[PDB]
C-alpha cells in the first residue's frame, strides 16, 4: 500500500499568517493527490486535486505544490474558518490511503494549567466503585502529559482522558483524567497522585491526597 | 450545489448488523464511483471500499474484507454500507464520498453497545481548601454510567455559565458513558451559597440536582 506521511500533525498560527503542511508518498504517485478539509462540525470538502488544481468555490488563499514526492498545501492569509483538520489522499492506486492529518489551531502565548485533584465521593464508594479525577484547567499548548501514581507505582490502562475544544474567548484547552478502581483495590493503597508535565511548568507538578485522611 | 445525504445515527448491540445509507441528489450514481470511509473517535480517515453503481463491482481494503459489504440501487440513487458482527472497534463516524471526492456526505455515527437505556449517577467533585489558590476554588459533578448520549449539565439553574467546562463524554468498556463538568468560582462565595449542578438525561427522563459542598482532603 502507498503510505502518506503527513507533517506536521499540528500547526499553530494566527489570523493573517500563512502556513504549510506536507505529505510524502512512499511510492511514485505523480500528482494523483487531493487535499481535504474537515471542519469542527465533521463535514468534509475537497479543496485541491492533481496536487495543485483548486476545485470550484475554493478561496484563492489555498494553493498546492509538488517537489519530487513531497506535496504541500499552503494557506495564505489565514481566516477564521481555516482553523480545521486537513488530510491528503492519493488516488493513484487501491487501496486508497490518507495522510495522518494536520490540525491547524490558534496560536497563543504559553499558559500553564491550574491542576486540581478530586478524591472519590463517599456516595460513590458505598456503591462499589471509586473515581479519582485530575483536572488540568485552561492551558496552552494542547500538549500535556498526565501520569497516575498510586503509592508511587505508575498506573497504566485504568484511566481515561477527555479534552475540550480550544476556548472561543482565551484560546486555551482544559483536560480531565479519571482513574477508575473498585472499592476493594482503592482501599489497598494510601497515596493517590496525579503528575502533570506541560511546557508552561518549569518542572512537572504533582497533586496528591492520602486516602484515609478523607 | 449537489449533495449526498446519509442516514441517521445508529445505536446497535454487538454481534448484530447494521445497514447505513447514502442518497445522492443532483446526479445519477451510475456515472461515478461511491466510496465509504471510517473515522474512529479522535482518529483519522480510513478507507473501507468503493462501488461502481453501473455494474455493482466493488473493491475493499483487505482490513475490512469480512466486516463490510457495499451495495448500490440506481433506482433510488442510493449506496449502502452493511457492517457485520459488530464489536466496540466498529464505533465510529462513517462517510460516503462520490464525484471524485468533491462531494462528501455529512457522516453517520454508529455506536456499538449492549447497554439498555440508563440514567446517570451524579457524584460531587467537592471544592477543597488544598485545591484552592488565589481566591478561587474548583468544584464539579461527575455524571457516570448513562446510555445513550446526550446529557445536559447546568449550574445553579443556568445562572452560572462563566468558567464552566463540561467535558465530552467517554464511552467506557461497560458500554456506558461518563463525563465531568467543573467550574472555578470565588472561594469566598462558598460561605453564602451552595453550588448545584442540574443534570438532565432525556432518554431515561432522569433529572438530578446535586449539591456540591466543600470537603477538604
UniProtKB/Swiss-Prot annotation, chain B:
Region Disordered: start-end pairs: 115-135
Effect of residue 211 to R: In IMGT allele IGHG1*03
Domain Ig-like: 120-213
Disulphide bridges: 141-197
Chain residue ranges for the region called CH1: 115-212
Subunit annotation: Immunoglobulins are composed of two identical heavy chains and two identical light chains; disulfide-linked. Interacts with FCGR1A; this interaction mediates IgG effector functions on monocytes. Interacts with FCGR2A and FCGR3A.
Function summary: Constant region of immunoglobulin heavy chains. Immunoglobulins, also known as antibodies, are membrane-bound or secreted glycoproteins produced by B lymphocytes. In the recognition phase of humoral immunity, the membrane-bound immunoglobulins serve as receptors which, upon binding of a specific antigen, trigger the clonal expansion and differentiation of B lymphocytes into immunoglobulins-secreting plasma cells. Secreted immunoglobulins mediate the effector phase of humoral immunity, which results in the elimination of bound antigens.
Disease listed for this protein: Multiple myeloma: A malignant tumor of plasma cells usually arising in the bone marrow and characterized by diffuse involvement of the skeletal system, hyperglobulinemia, Bence-Jones proteinuria and anemia. Complications of multiple myeloma are bone pain, hypercalcemia, renal failure and spinal cord compression. The aberrant antibodies that are produced lead to impaired humoral immunity and patients have a high prevalence of infection. Amyloidosis may develop in some patients.
UniProt protein name: Immunoglobulin heavy constant gamma 1
Species per Swiss-Prot/TrEMBL record: Homo sapiens
Gene behind this protein: IGHG1
Amino acid at each position: 500500500d502507498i503510505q502518506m506521511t503527513q507533517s506536521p500533525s499540528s500547526l499553530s498560527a494566527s489570523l493573517g499568517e500563512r502556513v504549510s503542511l506536507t505529505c510524502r508518498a512512499s511510492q511514485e504517485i505523480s500528482g494523483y493527490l487531493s487535499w481535504l478539509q474537515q471542519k469542527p462540525d465533521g463535514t468534509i470538502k475537497r479543496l485541491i486535486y492533481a496536487a495543485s488544481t483548486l476545485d470550484s468555490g475554493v478561496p484563492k488563499r489555498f494553493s498546492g505544490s509538488r517537489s519530487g514526492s513531497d506535496y504541500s498545501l499552503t494557506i495564505s492569509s489565514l481566516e477564521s474558518e481555516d482553523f480545521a483538520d486537513y488530510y491528503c489522499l492519493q488516488y493513484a492506486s487501491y487501496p486508497r490511503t490518507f495522510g495522518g492529518g494536520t490540525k491547524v489551531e490558534i496560536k497563543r502565548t504559553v499558559a500553564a494549567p491550574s491542576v486540581f485533584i478530586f478524591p472519590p465521593s463517599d456516595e460513590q464508594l458505598k456503591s462499589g466503585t471509586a473515581s479519582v479525577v485530575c483536572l488540568l484547567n485552561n492551558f496552552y499548548p494542547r500538549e500535556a502529559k498526565v501520569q497516575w501514581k498510586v503509592d508511587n507505582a505508575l498506573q497504566s490502562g485504568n484511566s481515561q482522558e477527555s479534552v475540550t475544544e480550544q476556548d472561543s474567548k482565551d484560546s486555551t484547552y482544559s483536560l480531565s483524567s479519571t482513574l477508575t478502581l473498585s472499592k476493594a483495590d482503592y482501599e489497598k493503597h494510601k497515596v493517590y497522585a496525579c503528575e502533570v508535565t506541560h511546557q508552561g511548568l518549569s518542572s512537572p507538578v504533582t497533586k496528591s491526597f492520602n486516602r484515609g485522611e478523607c | 450545489q449537489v449533495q449526498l445525504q446519509q442516514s441517521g445515527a445508529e445505536l446497535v448491540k454487538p454481534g448484530a448488523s447494521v445497514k447505513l445509507s447514502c442518497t445522492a441528489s443532483g446526479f445519477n450514481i451510475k456515472d461515478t464511483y461511491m466510496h465509504w470511509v471510517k473515522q474512529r473517535p479522535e482518529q483519522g480517515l480510513e478507507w473501507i471500499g468503493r462501488i461502481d453503481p453501473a455494474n455493482g463491482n466493488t473493491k475493499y481494503d483487505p482490513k475490512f474484507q469480512g466486516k463490510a459489504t457495499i451495495t448500490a440501487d440506481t433506482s433510488s440513487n442510493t449506496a449502502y454500507l452493511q457492517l457485520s458482527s459488530l464489536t466496540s472497534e466498529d464505533t465510529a463516524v462513517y462517510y460516503c464520498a462520490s464525484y471524485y471526492g468533491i462531494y462528501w456526505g455529512q457522516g453517520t455515527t454508529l455506536t456499538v453497545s449492549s447497554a439498555s437505556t440508563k440514567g446517570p449517577s451524579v457524584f460531587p467533585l467537592a471544592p477543597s481548601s488544598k485545591s484552592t489558590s488565589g481566591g478561587t476554588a474548583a468544584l464539579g459533578c461527575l455524571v457516570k454510567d448513562y446510555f445513550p448520549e446526550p446529557v445536559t449539565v447546568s449550574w445553579n439553574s443556568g445562572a452560572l455559565t462563566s468558567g464552566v467546562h463540561t467535558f465530552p463524554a467517554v464511552l467506557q468498556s461497560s458500554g456506558l458513558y461518563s463525563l465531568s463538568s467543573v467550574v472555578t468560582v470565588p472561594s469566598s462565595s462558598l460561605g453564602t451559597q451552595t453550588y448545584i449542578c442540574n443534570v438532565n438525561h432525556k432518554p431515561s427522563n432522569t433529572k438530578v440536582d446535586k449539591k456540591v459542598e466543600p470537603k477538604s482532603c
